[PDB]
């Protein structure tokens, strides 16, 4: 199928700027692209057709230009309006395909994540698995890495992250990586660190603990 | 004015199939196709197939062949996607749009689970003692293993706002949901300072109010 690969995955601005988004085909597609806007609970907004061709309706802000392999949705003086995630989708050939969108948020400064480890708690471990669990606090950009090891054993598979909205005052993130395991594994090991590392840190932060204190 | 009514949710068991509903208004239903797009957070938008509801006409992505199957209802404007032998994989929204992708249905949300309604176990995040100085501690409640969604928390009934960060609800390997809710406050309050989280999961008529404080 013709992959259209769509750049940046994120971009932040400030209102009144530019905010230009690509996206490029695998092979020719002429001007068969379209431009789409998407906001939280909501369907797709169409916003440009075969390439240039602004909706009826939208905004002179939008512009879509390019074609056969190169497209461009530029989106001059940007609004508060305009944070939203951008798809662009080709219709020259079967089967239709999207790019992998652009979300579009809000920026600010650099913020270090400030971290917190938690123990398993007595409690849990009568279900049979126990749960560390790991805090990014207020941090910016979204951009973050975070590792589990146990007894200096980095983990793979057995945990997951979930991030928050930018928040509505100071527009950072906050981010728990849980890392699931059986009561069983959690006994066997006593050593527990979360490593994070994030552009406003100048080196990894790692917090950790004991098992049983 | 041109309208494309869908379902909005359906709970589906792992193997069974569900038949979502696209019912349009406003305009003359076999005149143009309808295309159909399955959305995921991660895999992202991607066509499935469309239909040409004057002849009945179909053309799938190879992806969805033996998943979708696409048919309409001229008596009631209605067409029509019946999904397959679900797994996990098909949880998606799903949407309708008419040929020029120009008007969209709302989107039908599909959860695909074994689980039966559950209320959610309540753990502490406890605060770390003898931690930093900086008067600043994190604490906090792991909501997990509920069904289906959604689950609210609140801290001290509503009255603890300020640096609560609820975190959206991840899916785990059990089909059953799970999320945290943290907050920060004064490292001074704790010890004398009460902190409860609470969670109701309407879904069960269950409620949870749970007392987070360092652990002895
Ligand atoms: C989802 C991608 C997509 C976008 C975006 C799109 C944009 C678009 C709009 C919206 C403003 C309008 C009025 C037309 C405008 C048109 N679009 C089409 C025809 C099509 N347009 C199609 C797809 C398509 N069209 C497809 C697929 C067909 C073929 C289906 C068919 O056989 O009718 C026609 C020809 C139909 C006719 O009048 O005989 C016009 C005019 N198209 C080009």
């Known amino acids: 199928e013709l992959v259209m690969t769509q750049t940046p995955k994120f971009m932040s601005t400030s209102v009144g700027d530019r905010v230009s988004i690509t996206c490029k085909a695998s092979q020719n597609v002429g001007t068969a692209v379209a431009w789409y806007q998407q906001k939280p609970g909501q369907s797709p907004k169409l916003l440009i057709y075969s390439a240039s061709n602004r909706y009826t309706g939208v905004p002179d802000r939008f512009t879509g230009s390019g074609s056969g392999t190169d497209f461009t949705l530029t989106i001059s003086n940007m609004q508060s309006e305009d944070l939203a995630d951008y798809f662009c989708?080709?219709?020259?050939?079967?089967?239709?395909?999207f790019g992998g969108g652009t979300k579009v948020e809000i920026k600010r400064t650099v913020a270090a994540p400030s971290v917190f480890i938690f123990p398993p708690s007595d409690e849990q471990l009568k279900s049979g698995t126990a749960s560390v669990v790991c805090l990014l606090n207020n941090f910016y950009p979204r951009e973050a890495k975070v590792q589990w090891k146990v007894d200096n054993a980095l983990q793979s598979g057995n945990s997951q992250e979930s991030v928050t909205e930018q928040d509505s005052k100071d527009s950072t993130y906050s981010l728990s990586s849980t890392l699931t395991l059986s009561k069983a594994d959690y006994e066997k090991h006593k050593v527990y660190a979360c490593e994070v590392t994030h552009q406003g840190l100048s080196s990894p932060v790692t917090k950790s603990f004991n098992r049983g204190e | 004015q041109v309208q494309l009514l869908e379902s909005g949710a359906e709970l589906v068991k792992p193997g069974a199939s569900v038949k979502l509903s696209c019912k349009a208004s406003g305009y003359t239903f076999t005149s143009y196709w309808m295309h159909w797009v399955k959305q995921r957070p991660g895999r992202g938008l991607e066509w499935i197939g469309r239909?040409?509801?004057?002849?009945?006409?179909?053309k799938y992505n190879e992806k969805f062949k033996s998943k979708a199957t696409l048919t309409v209802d001229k008596p009631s404007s209605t067409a029509y996607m019946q999904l397959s032998s679900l797994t996990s994989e098909d949880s998606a929204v799903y949407y309708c749009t008419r040929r020029d992708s120009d008007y969209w249905g709302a989107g039908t949300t599909v959860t695909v689970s074994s689980a039966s309604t559950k209320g959610p176990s309540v753990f502490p995040l406890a605060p770390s003692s003898k931690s930093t100085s900086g008067g600043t501690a994190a604490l906090g409640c792991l909501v997990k293993d509920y069904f289906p969604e959604p689950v609210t928390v609140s801290w001290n009934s509503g009255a603890l706002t300020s640096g609560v960060h609820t975190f959206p609800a991840v899916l785990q390997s059990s089909g059953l949901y799970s999320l945290s809710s943290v907050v920060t406050v004064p490292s001074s309050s704790l010890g004398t300072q009460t902190y409860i989280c609470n969670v109701n999961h309407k879904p069960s008529n269950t409620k949870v109010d749970k007392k987070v404080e360092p652990k002895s």
């Open positions: 989708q080709q219709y020259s050939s079967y089967p239709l395909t």
């Open positions: 239909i040409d509801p004057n002849s009945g006409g179909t």
